[PDB]
Design a protein around this ligand. Structure first.
Ligand SMILES: C[C@@H]1O[C@@H](O[C@H]2[C@H](O[C@H]3[C@H](O)[C@@H](O)[C@@H](O)O[C@@H]3CO)O[C@H](CO)[C@H](O)[C@@H]2O)[C@@H](O)[C@H](O)[C@@H]1O
Lengths: 307, 314
């Protein structure tokens, strides 16, 4: 049986699997009221990608496709309908057993980025753009979405189009940012399908442990963050290794390699998420050289040393 | 410890010199420039070189602080920003690196977004900081591009809404232009400490040694803000190879690893290549252009070979 391993990467060598951001801090929030069911950064410990998760760091919250036409919308700006393909350019098959094209954003909000086009030497253009994932026009599972520009005219129809995500447009009330609210991938009155399962601690005194990144803002007030269950490099590692899971729960230790000492231990669950025994919210303050190391397979009854 | 490569198709790889997916494998035997890029540089036993670092988000990115608006003759509004290491710690110019890790390694007008999140918070706004972001261009050929000195200059279309003394991030997106006046040349290094200074601590140049061999690149097409063109960025190894080699640190048993590009469906070898100790590929090919290969293809380590080994022609 191929031994289970995690990569040896400090926090400063990890990136977020739900938005293209470095990992800033480890983070807990025991009093979280929302169901945690993100769809990017989802991978079982034996290497099965789930939800909308794919391997490319450049694919996370990215889109590829073609503008069909300018469209009208209640949102501020100029609006454009875009058909979307798979990120590799092949047509998206809405009957595939996935919630949405892989890489599709997995949260409610106004995602800010840049739309660029290279015509079929070719002419080019790029503009700032916003994709409102809560919008009735956000229907990636049907093969098309809508973005808005401040630019009023220079977006070409029928030309290859890329969305590069950068951050959020706003986190004010009207912008509906909620990292745990899933988009309706096929539109408002339709049920999402093929979702990666929700995650939660089962043991008393335990809470989820997140890899947190702070996400840029185009304007307004706020310090928004995106929490992922595992960094993108862990997704990539687990997929490569495909090591069989010998129980439902791996014990892992966060180690200081300089001193060799364990800072804390955590449960790494089969479906691909961490829990710790902690009763507070906020960052985990840990030396920069720290990283998780697999210790042993345990079970759901194992009692974690309190953080 | 046995040497290995990850098992990743082209469609599962990203560029180590700009945040782009890999589009095609590519050769250009008649290239006249010295190939000495500084990102995507890693020896086969896992030593990062040049300005190479591990984060896909760090490639051609900057972290720092805007000091002030400044004057420049070129069109737009110009701003000076000090730069730190990507992790926020101060950049130490005496470090044995060409420039802060992640610094762009080519001449051009790099287009992206500058964003700011103020240090000070506002009581009337729930003790939250103010934010702004705008499109920006960094001319890496400019005398004001001095990342090794700890500061660079960027231009914006926005004329006023960039704040002094506030934490600033540059997220790269593509190039502003590739017209003659924009000086795009992927093999021309920036002058990291400014005009007329010698770059130091560089990853070495790479080149084939055997007759009939040429470099093999992982090619990505880079977006443009405007104008005509189809610019590409060629890297020696994808970022995932850098990350893998770094992790594994398998000792190199010769100067050259023989690798085979394989079709896993048929099990057949599509072609073979030399993977050199310093971290680059050569093939036996006498043409320039894309390598047309099945989508399911990837490189597999075969064996360490010696100075006399001859590659089968592609
Ligand atoms: C706090 C300031 O944000 C920007 O001010 C611009 C302003 O931003 C608003 C957003 O558009 C809106 O979604 C919400 O977040 O309120 C923000 C203001 O609090 O937008 C107007 C246009 O309507 C102007 O563009 C303002 O410049 C930023 O530009 C400022 O530097 C401040 O950080």
């Amino acid at each position: 049986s191929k031994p289970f391993t995690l990569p040896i990467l400090t926090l400063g060598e990890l990136t977020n699997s739900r938005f293209p951001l470095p990992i800033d801090v480890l983070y807990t929030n025991p009093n979280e009221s929302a169901i945690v069911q993100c769809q990017n950064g989802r991978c079982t410990l034996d290497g099965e990608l789930q939800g909308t998760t794919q391997l490319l760091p450049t694919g996370i919250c990215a889109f590829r496709g073609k503008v069909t036409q300018q469209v009208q919308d209640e949102h501020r700006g100029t609006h454009w309908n875009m058909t979307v393909t798979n990120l590799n350019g092949t047509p998206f098959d809405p009957t595939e057993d996935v919630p949405a094209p892989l890489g599709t954003p997995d949260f409610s909000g106004q995602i800010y980025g840049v739309i660029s086009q290279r015509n079929t030497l070719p002419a080019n253009r790029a503009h700032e753009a916003v994709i409102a994932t809560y919008s009735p026009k956000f229907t990636p599972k049907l093969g098309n979405i809508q973005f808005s520009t401040w630019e009023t005219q220079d977006v070409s129809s029928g030309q290859p189009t890329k969305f590069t995500p950068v951050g959020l447009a706003s986190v004010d009330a009207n912008s509906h940012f909620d990292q745990w609210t899933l988009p309706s991938y096929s539109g408002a009155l339709t049920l999402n399908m093929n979702l990666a399962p929700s995650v939660a601690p089962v043991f008393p005194g335990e809470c989820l442990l997140f890899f947190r990144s702070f996400i840029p803002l185009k304007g307004g007030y706020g310090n928004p963050a995106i929490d992922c269950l595992m960094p993108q490099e862990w997704v990539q590692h687990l997929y490569q290794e495909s090591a069989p899971s010998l129980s439902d729960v791996a014990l892992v230790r966060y180690v200081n390699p300089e001193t060799g000492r364990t800072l804390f231990e955590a449960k790494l669950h089969r479906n691909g998420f961490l829990t710790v025994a902690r009763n507070s919210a906020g960052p985990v303050v840990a030396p920069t050289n720290g990283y998780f190391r697999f210790d042993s397979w345990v079970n759901q009854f194992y009692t974690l040393a309190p953080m």
